[PDB]
């Protein structure tokens, strides 16, 4: 088996070297592509925009994003998998030959296993939902041209994300291909599910509790058994160039809490009391109201994102991240429309 994964690793290293050497003027473009491809933008930009227009799309988008980031974590733990920025300096494969010279970037110090890519998986899962929903909405409200344009844009986005994750290292081509396929599969699976709407308040809590308990118990069971699931945190603390390039917000534990928090926040916002009576006469039916709601949500969420929880004790950071993630869907669905209604309603 060892002589089989080495071929894939060497192919990835050679591809990264070729991209980095023969394309040097596209560094900033690839960094920008890798920056605006974070899932943070799927909770702070896409969801507020898509919730106030055909609100059935926003709930599906949030559910797909959360379940995709839980499945990516769980399959990242078991599949293991290296990243082409510590493997180059740690392997003993490049003996009898010169080791290739690879370059690191302020974003190439990721902590975590990388067998399914997570940027590609999330981007595919979200943009497939968006494109399919738009095609369904504008279906004969010349369609072939729109179909071709939207699918071309989707595939261009996926290709650019793959090239970005390969150029800056931190991932192998088979990893990004697997991530794209898994994201598309998850998007389709939730495209054929109709129970995520009008769910009770007990359902959301039971679901998030089951996910958290499964993750924590699985980790504890393997840790007691003898294996170490958190092994990439030690290999990223030696081979990263600058010790300031690693952050705690990219620790497998942080993402899980940040996803459970936003799921619970969406549940609370949907099953609250202000949402059920947001309209008070003539409201929630006019374009100015919804456009102003979108603008206010975007501006206030962008301002509120600046509040960085203190990172001195890990438990405090985890709980504050949970609460801060829970705030955004609750404050974007229940509070801003209520304030706008009570101000410009009479
Ligand atoms: O695609 P990757 O390079 O593995 O990055 C994807 C991962 O980035 C962060 O570190 C988070 O832990 C995850 O929420 C995300 O899935």
Residue numbers in the entry: 1 to 141, 147 to 351
What does the original paper state about this entry?
Human glucose-6-phosphatase catalytic subunit 1 (hG6PC1) is a key enzyme in glucose metabolism, governing the final common step of gluconeogenesis and glycogenolysis, and directly regulating energy homeostasis. G6PC1 catalyzes the conversion of G6P to free glucose, which is then transported to various tissues through the bloodstream, supporting essential physiological functions. G6PC1 contains a transmembrane domain (TMD) composed of nine transmembrane helices and an extracellular domain (ECD) formed by two extracellular helices and two extracellular loops. In this study, we determine the cryo-EM structures of G6PC1 in both the partially open and fully open states, in either the apo form or in complex with the substrates G6P or F6P and the product phosphate.
Therefore, we introduced the H176N mutation to block the initial step of hydrolysis to capture the state of G6PC1 bound to the substrate G6P before the beginning of the reaction. We successfully determined the complex structure of G6P and G6PC1H176N at a 2.9 Å resolution, and cryo-EM maps revealed a local density that clearly defined G6P. G6PC1G6P forms a narrow, deep, positively charged cavity facing the ER lumen, accommodating G6P at its deepest position, 16.1 Å from the orifice. G6P is roughly oriented parallel to the membrane, with its phosphate group positioned at the bottom of the cavity and the glucose moiety near the opening, tilted toward the cytosol. Three cryo-EM densities (W1, W2, W3) in the active center are identified as water molecules, which form a hydrogen bond network with nearby residues to stabilize G6P. G6P interacts extensively with conserved residues from EL1, EL2, TM1, TM2, TM3, and TM4. Charged residues, including R83EL1, K76TM2, H119TM3, R170TM4, form multiple salt bridges with G6P. The putative imidazole nitrogen (H176) is 2.7 Å from the phosphorus atom of the phosphate group, facilitating the formation of a phosphohistidine bond during hydrolysis. Notably, EL2 undergoes dramatic rotation toward the active center, which, together with other changes in ECD, reduces the volume of the substrate-binding pocket from 1651.0 Å3 to 1364.0 Å3. The comparison suggests that PS is likely directly engaged in stabilizing the partially open state of G6PC1G6P.
